[PDB]
Amino acid sequence: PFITVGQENSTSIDLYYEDHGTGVPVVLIHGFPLSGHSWERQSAALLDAGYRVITYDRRGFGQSSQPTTGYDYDTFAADLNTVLETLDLQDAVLVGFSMGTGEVARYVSSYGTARIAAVAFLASLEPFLLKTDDNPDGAAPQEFFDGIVAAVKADRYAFYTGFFNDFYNLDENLGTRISEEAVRNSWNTAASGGFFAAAAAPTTWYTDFRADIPRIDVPALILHGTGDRTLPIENTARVFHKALPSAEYVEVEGAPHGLLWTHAEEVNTALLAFLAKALEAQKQKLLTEVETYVLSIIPSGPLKAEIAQRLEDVFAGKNTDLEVLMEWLKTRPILSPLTKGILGFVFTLTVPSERGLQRRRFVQNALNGNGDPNNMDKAVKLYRKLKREITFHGAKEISLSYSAGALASCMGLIYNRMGAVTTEVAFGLVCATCEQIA
Amino acid sequence: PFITVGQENSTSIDLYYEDHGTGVPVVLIHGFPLSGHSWERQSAALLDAGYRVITYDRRGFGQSSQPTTGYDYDTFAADLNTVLETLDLQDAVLVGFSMGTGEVARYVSSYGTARIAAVAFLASLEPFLLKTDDNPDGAAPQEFFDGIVAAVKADRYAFYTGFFNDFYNLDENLGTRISEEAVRNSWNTAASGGFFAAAAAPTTWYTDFRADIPRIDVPALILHGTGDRTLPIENTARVFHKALPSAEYVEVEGAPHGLLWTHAEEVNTALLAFLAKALEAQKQKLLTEVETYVLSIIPSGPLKAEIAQRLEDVFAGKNTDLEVLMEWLKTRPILSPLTKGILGFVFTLTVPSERGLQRRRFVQNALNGNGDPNNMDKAVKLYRKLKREITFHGAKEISLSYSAGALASCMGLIYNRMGAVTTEVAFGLVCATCEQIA
Amino acid sequence: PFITVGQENSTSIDLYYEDHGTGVPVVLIHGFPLSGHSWERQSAALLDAGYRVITYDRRGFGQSSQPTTGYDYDTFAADLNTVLETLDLQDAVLVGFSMGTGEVARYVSSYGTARIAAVAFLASLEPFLLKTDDNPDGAAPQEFFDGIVAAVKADRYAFYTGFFNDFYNLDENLGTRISEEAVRNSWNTAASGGFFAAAAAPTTWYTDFRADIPRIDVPALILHGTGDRTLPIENTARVFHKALPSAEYVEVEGAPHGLLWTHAEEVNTALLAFLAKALEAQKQKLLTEVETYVLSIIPSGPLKAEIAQRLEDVFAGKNTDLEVLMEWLKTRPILSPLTKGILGFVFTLTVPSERGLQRRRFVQNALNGNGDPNNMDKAVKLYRKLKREITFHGAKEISLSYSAGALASCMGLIYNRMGAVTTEVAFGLVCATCEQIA
Amino acid sequence: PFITVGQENSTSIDLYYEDHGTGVPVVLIHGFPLSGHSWERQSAALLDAGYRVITYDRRGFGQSSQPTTGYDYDTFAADLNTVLETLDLQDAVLVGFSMGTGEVARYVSSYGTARIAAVAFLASLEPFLLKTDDNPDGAAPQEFFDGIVAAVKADRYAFYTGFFNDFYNLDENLGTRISEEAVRNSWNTAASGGFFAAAAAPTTWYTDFRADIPRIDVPALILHGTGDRTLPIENTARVFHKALPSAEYVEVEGAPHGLLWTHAEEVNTALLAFLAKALEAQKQKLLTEVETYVLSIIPSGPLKAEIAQRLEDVFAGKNTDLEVLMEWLKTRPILSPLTKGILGFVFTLTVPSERGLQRRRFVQNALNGNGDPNNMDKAVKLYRKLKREITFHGAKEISLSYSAGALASCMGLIYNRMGAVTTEVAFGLVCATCEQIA
């Protein structure tokens, strides 16, 4: 999986990325000098929680292309933008690490937060690393950073082992927090990067982000270890906390720089606690929107009120048995068969506790579609567009074109254990079919 | 140089036209019975001011073909329409004289004002010369014009020496305002015209232009000699003034009908003043709306005030150097490369005083954007459409159906070698680009 | 080289694969946690034997994509089916290893054996690894496999060194059967796999294949090690032998799990012996079918019996003098010049006795084609169609749609070393020319 | 970035290549068993000097495809030819190492020197490694190389740690000239190659390059380590020196075989010095012949002495400003506008120090010349031919069949936006233009 972001000479600067899981998109940006695979402990906990994980490799690092141009944060942000535009992500979360936090703060400032719901800064560079007469809160003068760039160009392979010692604090963490095999992969990941990228990237560490911080309007999370070597805490996060008081501030006690692996228990705990508090407001907004499209089919009366509460208890998570429900749903005087099917459909997508034994006939004949071959031949063409679809905003848009007949049969395909798509796009088909009946 | 505007049996009807200078196109349309060479004093000052002068000879007059058909303003306007379309003039200016003032009002009424920026009626026929019962403000009954046609048919050549005698007021202006030799050449221009034209043209003088006046939605200029013997001012310019009060009204005192030569020092003064104001207004009206679109791409703050000032200063023509701007624009904290390439692309257009030097490098790098195989080749698709588009709204509408990655790439093509198209069409892309990124 | 076998979100699940050599397609399916390059010792043996090696990487492992969906044998077999169909293989032999033996039995029991000639099971998973009350032939209860997954999730990179120590039995083979450099490479491939793929794979180890075994209606090979630490021989092959008795049962003495590298000599010898014992019956009644068309051109008499022995004493595997035949076929009264070049061509392919010199003349003058450009331009048309051909039937079905005169010129280039084909393709041409003489 | 160079059954053979920087193209070809990343020190100095670095990985090695066919220098040269043609490199430089030095000699012999300006053989195989009876100056009998292939087939991975041990002389250079980590990565690059490649490549070492040496008609550089254990200097570089005495000969004392890393400070010094001289000679040799053509368009006198001096001063790189030249060229008594447009077109090319400013106005006006409908459109016909032409003589021959009015117009197109083509092709037009006007 590759996304093109640039064009160097006769080649195209392509970036490696991975799009896993279904739900709220969480974009992860790695640090120097690793790949997107470095988030393998965080990506694990984000998948079990239900989030959609998207990790991409920075140019010159990992499996991405290795050009000798475009090594400033204006290019690094222009790449992140192209990725978000190509993926068409909406209300996503940007989580950065090391250099990754430098793109999270630059993109937000330069392109806005129309696609952003929340951000996070793990072991950040912000606001400034370079120590000048202007900024005393710097970590080191430019002579120091020029000492690193030269030390890479001499022998970048021998430079890595020294760097990955101040990355994990191996004299304290090896054999306890991190194994030597785990370290080896990090070296293998770094050594398999672009030689030019390894020598040009350190010149971006001392970037002035003081102008980009105020442009953060979305909820933010700031995290940093108290034993960081590459990025001293009192020169970064401690003074990042004063620049943006709106963000929650978390110091992991005794954590090194590469705290993504060493303190995975601590990081994942805080990262999930932040997301489930800053995304809860929008994650249920669909549940009341899906409820809206569903209720716009039910004829007004005593039924419409109880049905709406059979959606409230279910969407929330209250215990509801289907047998009393589905029986009751069938024997209805004013409900047309087609609505019985949609309700029977939605009531199965939202609960994993249907006992997994029986199916219903009143819905199965409702989501039939008469049995017309042409009507079925279009329904599978929709499912084809839905099996390669991800978002609710996209599944509804596509399934609003096809006729009301093909929509019924397409819902049947998913319901009759034939086709299979995520519950987020399943609502899309439902809410699109509901707009047809309006 | 000729332009085919029709067909007459075995012969084609061609019109002699000339094209001079570079700048805002000014179409000069002559009157009876001269040719395009009668503007040789107005066509001089317009060239010294920086305009593009275009003179064409009406059918049957000058070096143009001499057919015996199509001697009516419905045909004359079609002739003008063909000339304008063939030359593909955009935002041009129509200036007519005597009969030529009828081809200005008829064109705007029948064909529109997409190619027209401003018009001018010098010694005009408007609105109606024929003195009827419903039109009291005429000049003479049809028994008079029928006398002129009969007078020409008897002796065309002897008729001229009496016509030019009142055309210039040679009992008042000869050997003073107009030389004897100047008259002789004007006589030669008359005698070298179509014999049928000189007999058919006078019947086109009493054409009702009251159906064409309201169609005028552009700045106009009504100038007329006070001592016009051939075309009474009290029966034309005075009543024409009421029909179109929006027009700048000017009366040259003591001027005859042929005031293009005798009073060239007054006509040139007024015509240049009108053009240097009315066109200046359009270069300001449709320039402040560009700033509006540009100031939607820039985040709120001092940068939305510093750019705003530097735009309003540049628009006002305040003397400044681009090398201060182009450098200060570069070293800017918040702005992304894209909106740094858009601003630079505007500063190169709105500041003709470019020190007579090169282009820039950061705008060239930001504009292309990715250079995607189809997206860059969808920029050359729009490049073929904008070269044919003539308006600002037209350029805005088409480019609004294209992606911001395609618009930026298309702007990259225009910036390199312009142009082709005009600035009013180039701004149509910039404003459309800014409208997309929002 | 890649093959799209699915679609996860905005990414396409592609599998890496290789295709070398000419002959019977032998598919090699690796196991946990290596890749297709682990068969490198078997691939070298199969290419020299005269086979066609096709290795591919399982999803999430090796050089293929690393998705989070589709980790079950129903999905693993769906990929295998797509690879087999995309390549359009026929008479293909399926060989598996560890986790790769499960894809062989599952595909064969759901998609049929139309493209399959034989199967092989090295270090099998069959028939059941999980130990319940239903079968004592299980390896370990569910509580054991949960320990593995938890160990992978803890430290994926540290898990391998403890897994590869029991994979090759390094307390027995290190420094002898396998060097530490070979271990490091096996680790480098396991580390470059998928993070989700390495933890969701052991849950597929205890898949029940009992309902897939009787579906195997092709010659099989059940090979195992008597020192396997990962897959206990008593719980796998020992009981697999009872569910599949008509399969050649081979127990490599003292062999570990990673016997592909340690006991490569013992495996290759046993694998090649099986590939000959299973494919001999099909080469017979094909080589005799080849002879059938060959003897048809030979006139029924005392010569049609002699040439029968001259063929059957070469098809078997015996050696002979090329000089004797090419002088006994040359100086012959009854045979036509064309059928001399035909027998001279069949012999030149079925004989290993090169003697290392010059190439016959009479066959050149027989397979000439009159030196006709039109007839010889039709000859290169078949060559381009035969160079892309595989089966014997596929060659005969195409070489029969040409004139018999053109086939001679086409058998000229293949003879004159100007063109190269396989063995079944070459005979497909010859046995087609023989059909056109009836 | 990949380039297809062949086809292998179901898979395509693609080669991984990289393109960096702008300037004179330098093709770097690696050796056994590394990849293009082995030039990361030479590829650094070349970029800092202003060259275009192109590294491609040989088949079976690096990230390129791993087929089992075409492991011979006849195929390797075809691979190089395909890469050069696909990239359309003109006047490039070929630099090879170990095996790579064989692909330089084979290309020049089989394909020519139209795209090649200079070559370099670093630690070369030339002329013949195999020690035969007719070739006393060999290195080892075939019984030796057959021992290496057998050594690799046994254990490919364990073989490397012994090969790299002598490749770098790690008993002399380890932890000093080359780090331990630098070795480990080189081992990873080896282990990640084609298994069949590592067994087939050593058989290509003893290739007779005596049939390729005389074909070299370009400046060459023979550099070799004195302490090369793998490739003896006395059996290669010494005898190779006699076969090609025209080449600049350099011996680095105490350098092993992998002197690209251990002695990068010596190789970079020599390679840059050779390139900055040999290429400088071509930029002077084929520049003085331009002056010869230019000084045939200028009448004899002081102008044929003042231009001659100002040309020879500019060619010599003497610091001067164009605004003195471009103005002094303008105000010149004898010269016609055409030969004033040709001179200005040369001064813009031969003086890169253009103050970083604009173009000129008199050359733009004189070059187009008439703009004849067919003659200007016969300039775009030549513009399509010169973009494909690669040499100086080639550009001269084609444009010699066109009129001077077409050549001038074609020069007008190149001057506006160059380019596309190179200066060696642009001069091919200028010299052809001057040749016409005579």
3-class SS of residue B95 = strand
A35 and chain D: CB distance < 8 Å anywhere? no
Angstrom distances, CA of residue C30 to CA of C122, C247, C260: 10, 21, 10
Q: Among partner residues A52, A182, A387, which is closest to C7 by beta-carbon distance?
A: A387
DSSP state of B344: H
Contact A382, A402 (CB under 8 A): yes
Contact A28, A51 (CB under 8 A): no
Q: Among partner residues D356, D416, D417, which is closest to B358 by beta-carbon distance?
A: D356
3-class SS of residue B55 = strand
Place of tokens 């205890």: C206
Q: Among partner residues D9, D153, D196, which is closest to C19 by beta-carbon distance?
A: D9
Q: Among partner residues B299, B336, B372, which is closest to A78 by beta-carbon distance?
A: B336
> Within 10 A of C194 (CB to CB), how many other CB atoms are there?
26
Q: Give the long-range contacts of residues B178-186, CB within 8 A, separation 24 or more.
A: B178/B258, B178/B261, B178/B262, B182/B261, B186/B34, B186/B38, B186/B258
Closest Cα in chain A to B338: A78
B132 and chain A: CB distance < 8 Å anywhere? no
D2 and chain C: CB distance < 8 Å anywhere? no
Contact D182 A12 (CB under 8 A): no
Specify the amino acid at residue C234: E
Question: Which residues of D are identified as catalytic?
Answer: 98, 228, 257
D86 and chain B: CB distance < 8 Å anywhere? no
Contact A181 C155 (CB under 8 A): yes
Angstrom distances, CA of residue B435 to CA of B292, B350, B427, C337, D226: 10, 20, 12, 83, 67
Tell me: cis bond preceding D127? Omega within 30 of 0 counts: yes
Substitution target in D322, D358, D365, D414 with the highest count of B β-carbons within 10 Å is: D358
In this structure, the dihedral spanned by the alpha carbons of residues A385, A391, A393 and A396, taken in order and rounded to 10 degrees, is 40
D22 and chain B: CB distance < 8 Å anywhere? no
Contact D122, D28 (CB under 8 A): no
Substitution target in A4, A9, A71, A192 with the highest count of D β-carbons within 10 Å is: A9
Q: Which of A43, A64, A98, A186 is catalytic?
A: A98
C363 and chain D: CB distance < 8 Å anywhere? no
Angstrom distances, CA of residue A353 to CA of A322, A344, C347: 9, 14, 72
B336 and chain A: CB distance < 8 Å anywhere? yes
Contact C231, C123 (CB under 8 A): yes
Contacts of B335 in chain A (CB under 8 A): 110
Distance of residue A199 Cα from the nearest chain D Cα, in angstroms: 10
> Within 10 A of D237 (CB to CB), how many other CB atoms are there?
23
Nearest to A62 by CA among A193, A162, A156: A193
Backbone angles phi, psi at A210, to 5 degrees: -65, -25
For the four alpha carbons of A338, A342, A345 and A347, in that order, the dihedral sign comes to negative
Contact C233, C251 (CB under 8 A): yes
Q: Which chains touch B (3 or more CB pairs under 8 A)?
A: A, D
Nearest to D322 by CA among D342, D348, D294: D348
Nearest to D258 by CA among D150, D166, D184: D166
Distance of residue A20 Cα from the nearest chain C Cα, in angstroms: 6
Judge whether A257 counts as a catalytic residue.
yes
Contacts of D8 in chain C (CB under 8 A): 19-20
Closest Cα in chain C to D12: C1
Contact A250, A277 (CB under 8 A): no
- The rounded distance, in Å, linking the Cα atoms of C230 and A90 is 46
Structure tokens at C352: 């290993």
Distance of residue D357 Cα from the nearest chain B Cα, in angstroms: 5
Chain C touches chain B, with at least 3 Cβ pairs below 8 Å, answer no
- The rounded distance, in Å, linking the Cα atoms of B364 and A46 is 41
What resolution, expressed in A, was reported for this entry?
Answer: 3.0
> Within 10 A of C154 (CB to CB), how many other CB atoms are there?
12
Contact D161 C181 (CB under 8 A): yes
Contacts of C179 in chain D (CB under 8 A): 155, 157-158
- The rounded distance, in Å, linking the Cα atoms of A66 and A195 is 8
Taking each helix axis from N to C end, the angle separating A73-87 and B337-350, rounded to the nearest 10 degrees, works out to 100
Structure tokens at C173: 């083979």
3-class SS of residue B222 = strand
- The rounded distance, in Å, linking the Cα atoms of A181 and C157 is 5
In the beta sheet, which residues pair with residue C267? none
- The rounded distance, in Å, linking the Cα atoms of A329 and A348 is 13
A110 and chain B: CB distance < 8 Å anywhere? yes
Q: Among partner residues A8, A158, A187, which is closest to D19 by beta-carbon distance?
A: A8
| Residue C137 CA to its chain's centroid (Å) | 32
Contact B81, B102 (CB under 8 A): no
Contact B26, B46 (CB under 8 A): yes
> Within 10 A of B381 (CB to CB), how many other CB atoms are there?
12
Distance of residue A152 Cα from the nearest chain D Cα, in angstroms: 11
CB pairs below 8 Å between A and B: how many?
A: 30
Structure tokens at D24: 């004179």
Taking each helix axis from N to C end, the angle separating D264-294 and D423-436, rounded to the nearest 10 degrees, works out to 20
Structure tokens at B242: 């009421």
For the four alpha carbons of A364, A365, A367 and A369, in that order, the dihedral sign comes to positive
- The rounded distance, in Å, linking the Cα atoms of B34 and B96 is 13
Place of tokens 């080449």: D247
| Residue B112 CA to its chain's centroid (Å) | 13
Checking phi first, is residue C409 left (phi over 0); if not, alpha (psi -120 to 50) or beta?
alpha
Distance of residue D350 Cα from the nearest chain B Cα, in angstroms: 19
Q: Which of A38, A43, A186, A257 is catalytic?
A: A257
Angle at A94 between CA A93 and CA A100, to 5 degrees: 165
- The stretches of A296-336 forming alpha helices (DSSP H) are 302-316, 322-330
Contacts of A181 in chain C (CB under 8 A): 155, 157-158, 160-161, 187, 191
Structure tokens at A419: 């086709």
> Within 10 A of C260 (CB to CB), how many other CB atoms are there?
24
| Residue C300 CA to its chain's centroid (Å) | 40
**Terminal Cα distance for chain A, rounded:** 40
Structure tokens at B4: 């085919």
Q: Which of A57, A91, A212, A228 is catalytic?
A: A228
Distance of residue C70 Cα from the nearest chain A Cα, in angstroms: 12
Question: Which residues of C are identified as catalytic?
Answer: 98, 228, 257
Angle at D93 between CA D92 and CA D94, to 5 degrees: 125
- The rounded distance, in Å, linking the Cα atoms of B190 and B183 is 11
Technique behind the model: X-ray
Contacts of B417 in chain D (CB under 8 A): 416-417
| Residue D275 CA to its chain's centroid (Å) | 10
Checking phi first, is residue A396 left (phi over 0); if not, alpha (psi -120 to 50) or beta?
alpha
Domains of chain C: 1-279 (3.40.50.1820), 280-364 (1.20.91.10), 365-438 (1.10.10.180)
Contact A195 D47 (CB under 8 A): no
Place of tokens 């618009």: B407
State the DSSP string of C199-223. Answer: TSSGGGTT---TTTSTT--S--EEE
Contacts of B371 in chain A (CB under 8 A): 7
Contacts of A161 in chain D (CB under 8 A): 181
Angle at D48 between CA D47 and CA D54, to 5 degrees: 5
- The rounded distance, in Å, linking the Cα atoms of A218 and A117 is 6
Contact C30, C55 (CB under 8 A): yes
